[PDB]
Design a protein around this nucleic acid. Structure first.
Ligand code: CA
Ligand code: CA
Ligand code: CA
Ligand code: CA
Ligand code: CL
Lengths: 309, 17, 309, 315, 19, 18
RNA sequence: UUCUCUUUUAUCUU
C-alpha cells in the first residue's frame, strides 16, 4: 500500500506525477539499484506568455537538461516544415550549470538521468477574449546518428547526431488530449526505458542538424537551434518521451496563460564542481515504488484539463 | 478534482488484486 | 507449473523459443518493466534456396531489423576473406516500414528491441544427390566504432561505425552444432544483455565499411553491403548474438532447401505513422517469464536437426 | 454552453565469489571471482588482471595516477609540480596490464579480434611503501571521478564544409581538484581503494577500434573540452580498447623536495568479456552465473558503506 | 521431441527443481 | 583490520535490519 | 463506482 514504500520511494512517485500539489519538492532520488553519489535538482520554470493570434504555436517538452521547452510558431492549421526552427527556453540558471561555451558543458557534471518531466498551462484570459484549442500527444524521440559519404579531398564518410522519430510531430497521433484553450492543460512524461540508465553530457552541440550539415542528410523534418553557445545549448538527451503541444490561436483572439515546467533530474557531480557539496547517495532500491511508477504511468491519460494538476 | 489523488487511487486499485 | 506465468509472459516465451509450433501471433510483448506503447512485429521469411556445389555458403542471421539474413559463398573448405561481401535478404515489407532512402528509416518508428530470433533450414533435395554438412555457432557481434585521422585540409579525425567480433566468423566456434546437410537444422538467438534495452533506428547506413571508408581501416574482416537504399539497408543493431551457419556443398552435390526466419521485435511507433494504430502497452513485469527465459536459453543446444525443431 | 470534445536467504557460489573479487582480492589465495550473478547468463570469459609495479616518485612533484575502466591498461600516470594539478599542458601515459597485446593485437584496428564487448566487475588498487621511515615524506590523497566517455560535435571549414564528431571525455575536470569525498594521509601509511559500477546494472560495453589518443589525431584539445590529454602511445604496445561503467579512481602522491618516496602498486581487475568463437580464449569460457538477488544488493550496500579508501596496513 | 515440448520440460523441471 | 572482515561485518550489519 | 447473463475470443490442464 502507501506503507510498503520507503520514504525515497513515495517521494520519488510524487516529484514524478504531482509537483504543484506540494509546498516542497518531495523528490530525493531514484529508488533503483544505483546508490552512488548524485545530485537531485528539481527544475521549475514559470513563464507569463501570450500567444500569437492566427498562428499555431508548437511546444516541445523534451529531455534536454537546463532547457524547459522548445517552441516555434507556424501558420494556423499547419505543422512544422523544413523551414521551421525551434528555439529553447531555459530553466533558471542554465549557464551556471553548463557554462557559456559549447565545450564546457561537462565541467560541472558528467552524466545524468531524468526522473520526472511535467508541464502545465494556466489560461489567464477573460471570457471575452480567449479562443482556440490545445492539442497534446507524445513522441518517442530518441537521439541517434546518420552516416553518409562526403566528397572532400580525400573523400570521407561523416557521422553526426540525428533526431529520430521527430516526424511524429507532424501529425496528431490517435492517442491525444484536445480541448479548448481556456481549459488549459497538464501532462507529464516518463522513462521510455526498462531501467534508469545514465546518459553522458554532450559537448559542442548547438544546432541540429549541426553546422555544415544539410537538413536533408539528417532525415530530421525540421531544425533545432539553441542559439548562442553563451546563452543556451544542447547538453544531452534523456530517456523520456517528448511531450508535443499544439496551441491554435484564431485571428483576433487574446490567448494569455502561464506556463510551468517540472523536471526531477539526477546528475553525477564532478568532484571539482561547487555542486558536489550538495550531493548525496542515490536512494536505495524500492521494488514497490518502481512497480507503482510503471503501472501509474501507463494508467494515466495523455493529459488532463488545466483545472486539475 | 485533484492530481495526486488520481495517482494515490491507481496505486491502491492495482494493489488490491 | 506454467500457470505462474502471465498470459503475455507465456506468449512471449513461445515467440522466443518455438514460433514455428504456433499458427500466428506468438507474442504480445516483453513482460519486462517497460509498459509504454509499442508494436509487436512477428517477422517471418520463407526463402527457397539452392546451394552452389563446391561452395561453402555462409549465412548470418543477426539482428538487423527488416533484414532476415546475410549470405555469401566461398570456395569449399575456406572462410570469408577481406574479399568477401555479404548481401541482405529481407523480411517481407522492408520498404513498407523503413522507406526507400537511407534517411527515412526513422519515419515510421524511432527505436526497437528484439525478443526472439529463430531460423530453420529444411532440406528439399533427394537422398541420392545431397551431400555436405551444416555447421553452426553463434557470435557476440556488437556494433561499435573506429577512430582514425584523415589528411584533408584542414587535417581532421573521422569516426564511423565498425563491427567488432566479426572475426568469429572465420572459424568454426568450439561450441557448435554440425551434422549432415540432409538433417537440416533449427536454432535461435537470445538477448546478449542483462536486460532489454531499447536501441535507436540508424539513418544513412547502406554499407559497412561506409562509402569512402577503406576496409580494415575498420578492422572488420569483410564487407557488408545492403545495396540500393531503395530496396534494403541497415536500420539498426539489436542486442542479440548473431547466428552463423556454414553449409558446405561438396562437388556435384544437389543441396536445396527452404529457409524460415522468425523475429519478435518491439518498436516504438511514431504518432504520424499509420503503424501506430496497432500499438499497445508493453506487457508489465512477469518476473517468472524473465527468469525462465534466461534459464531455458542457457539450457538449449546451439542448434538441433530439422525434425527435432 | 460549450460542448466537451469526445475523447477516445544466502548467497550462491558465484554470487559470493562476485562480492570477493569486487571488494577484497588481496585477501584471497585465488581469484575468488567467477562471473556476475546478474540477469545475463550467456557465454563469457572471466579474466583477473593483476599488475605489480615498483615505483619511485619524483621529489617536488605531485604524481597523479588514474585507475580507469580501460581494458588492458592498469592505470595512467603523469606528474606536475608539487601543489599543482594537471593542466592543458599535461598528458597521461598508460601502464599496460600483463599481456595487453596478446588480448588486443598490435594495431589500433585489432582490438576487437579476440573479444567483442565487456563489463567490469571490479577495479581495485593498492600502494605499498618500500621507503625507509626517515627518507619518505609527503602524502597520498584519493577521490573518485564519474568519468564517462562521450562525444563532441563541431564544424570544420574544409572543402566542402563539414561537421566532425569524435570521442571526448567528460568528467575529467574533476581531477583538477581534490574531491570533498576523499582519503588523505601520510604517504608511508600506503593506501587501498576500489571502484564500483556507476550504472543500475551491468550492461555490456563494446570494444573500441582505432583509438590511441584523446584528443584524437588532428583534434585540438580546445575542440574536445577535455582539461588535458590522454596518450596511449604506439599502437603496437598500448591503446584504448574501451571504457567501462566504473567510476575512475584518482590518486595524488605529494612528494615534497628531497623526499624519497618508493613503493609498490598493485592493480586488481576482474572483467567479463564476450569471447569471439575464433579466439583462443573461447576454450576457457563459461556462462555468466545466474541472477543472485542477494549478491546484487549486498554489492550495492557494501559499496556505499565502505570509505573512500583505507591505509595499506588494512587492505 | 518438439521444440515447445523440450521447452515446457525445462521450465516445469526448473519450477520443481528450485523447490 | 582485515578487508574481507570489514565486508562480512557490513553484510551481517545490514542483513540484520531484516 | 456494483453484480449477474450470454457473450466472444484466448490459453492452461486431461
Ligand atoms: Ca526522417
Ligand atoms: Ca578486427
Ligand atoms: Ca541496462
Ligand atoms: Ca571542459
Ligand atoms: Cl513570470
Amino acid at each position: 500500500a502507501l506503507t510498503r514504500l520507503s520514504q525515497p520511494g513515495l517521494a520519488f512517485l510524487k516529484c514524478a506525477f504531482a509537483p504543484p500539489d506540494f509546498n516542497t519538492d518531495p523528490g530525493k532520488g531514484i529508488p533503483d539499484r544505483f546508490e552512488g553519489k548524485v545530485v537531485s535538482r528539481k527544475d521549475v520554470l514559470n513563464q507569463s506568455i501570450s500567444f500569437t493570434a492566427g498562428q499555431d504555436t508548437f511546444i516541445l517538452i523534451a529531455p534536454t537538461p537546463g532547457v524547459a521547452y522548445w517552441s516555434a510558431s507556424v501558420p494556423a492549421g499547419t505543422f512544422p516544415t523544413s523551414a521551421t526552427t525551434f528555439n529553447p527556453v531555459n530553466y533558471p540558471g542554465f549557464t551556471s550549470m553548463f557554462g557559456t561555451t559549447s565545450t564546457s558543458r561537462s565541467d560541472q557534471v558528467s552524466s545524468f538521468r531524468y526522473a520526472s518531466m511535467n508541464v502545465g498551462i494556466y489560461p489567464t484570459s477573460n471570457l471575452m477574449q480567449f479562443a482556440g484549442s490545445i492539442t497534446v500527444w507524445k513522441c518517442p524521440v530518441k537521439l541517434s546518428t546518420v552516416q553518409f559519404p562526403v566528397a572532400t579531398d580525400p573523400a570521407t564518410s561523416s557521422l553526426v547526431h540525428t533526431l529520430v522519430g521527430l516526424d511524429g510531430v507532424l501529425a496528431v497521433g490517435p492517442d491525444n488530449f484536445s480541448e479548448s484553450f481556456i481549459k488549459g492543460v497538464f501532462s507529464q512524461s516518463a522513462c521510455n526505458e526498462p531501467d534508469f540508465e545514465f546518459n553522458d553530457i554532450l559537448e559542442g552541440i548547438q544546432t541540429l542538424p549541426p553546422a555544415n550539415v544539410s537538413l536533408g542528410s539528417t532525415g530530421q523534418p525540421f531544425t533545432m537551434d539553441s542559439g548562442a553557445e553563451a546563452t543556451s545549448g544542447v547538453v544531452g538527451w534523456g530517456n523520456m518521451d517528448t511531450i508535443v503541444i499544439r496551441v491554435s490561436a484564431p485571428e483576433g483572439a487574446v490567448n494569455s496563460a502561464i506556463l510551468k515546467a517540472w523536471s526531477c533530474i539526477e546528475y553525477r557531480p564532478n568532484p571539482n564542481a561547487m555542486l558536489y557539496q550538495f550531493g548525496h547517495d542515490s536512494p536505495p532500491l524500492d521494488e514497490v515504488a518502481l512497480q507503482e511508477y510503471r503501472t501509474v504511468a501507463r494508467s494515466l491519460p495523455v493529459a488532463v484539463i488545466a483545472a486539475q494538476n | 478534482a485533484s492530481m495526486w489523488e488520481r495517482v494515490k487511487s491507481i496505486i491502491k486499485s492495482s494493489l488490491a488484486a
